Design a protein around this ligand. Structure first.
Ligand code: HEM
Length: 154
């Protein structure tokens, strides 16, 4: 799949807003993920013990993890499709080391869209949400293809 320059512009315009507060968006997104799909929390030996949202919001480790996910995702989106180099180390660690199924990437995609919609209603109308969904599907499709080459595809 290929996004048009117009769609990339919609994605990068809302992402520029996200970058004004990377730690806050990262936290919101990971908490949204863990509450919506608690099974994903088990994949993290660092957060596994966190029982409530209050505990998640107070976790300094969780806030740092959020910055890490968003920064890597941001580097990918800014490539506007030419992200093969960035995808390789990412696909290997998630497939071989952490064993994260594609299903879980759809869950986090859903959390990202939910949070952008909550925090940026003015810059995240239907067209911009369609563009972001298209960008994340591109991401998932390429990651799934690498999973298969690495011998996992989960
Ligand atoms: C947009 C999505 C994602 C991005 C860009 C991303 C990025 C990263 C990065 C950059 C790291 C650091 C080093 C490494 O490669 O291991 C990492 C670690 C990890 N990721 Fe993700 N990840 C994503 C989604 C997920 C999902 C959905 C899960 C789990 C449900 C997950 C679980 C893990 C785990 C278990 C680790 C290591 C935690 C630790 O021991 O510090 N990731 N991820």
């Amino acid at each position: 799949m290929v996004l048009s320059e117009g769609e990339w512009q919609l994605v990068l315009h809302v992402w520029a807003k996200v970058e004004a507060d990377v730690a806050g968006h990262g936290q919101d997104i990971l908490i949204r993920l863990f509450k919506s799909h608690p099974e994903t929390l088990e994949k993290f030996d660092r957060f596994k013990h966190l029982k409530t949202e209050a505990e998640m919001k107070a976790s300094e480790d969780l806030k740092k993890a959020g910055v890490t996910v968003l920064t890597a995702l941001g580097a990918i989106l800014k490539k506007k499709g030419h992200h093969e180099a960035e995808l390789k180390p990412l696909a290997q660690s998630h497939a071989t080391k952490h064993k994260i199924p594609i299903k879980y990437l759809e869950f986090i995609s859903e959390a990202i869209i939910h949070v952008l919609h909550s925090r940026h209603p003015g810059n995240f109308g239907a067209d911009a949400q369609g563009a972001m969904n298209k960008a994340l599907e591109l991401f998932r499709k390429d990651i799934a293809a690498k999973y298969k080459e690495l011998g996992y595809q989960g």
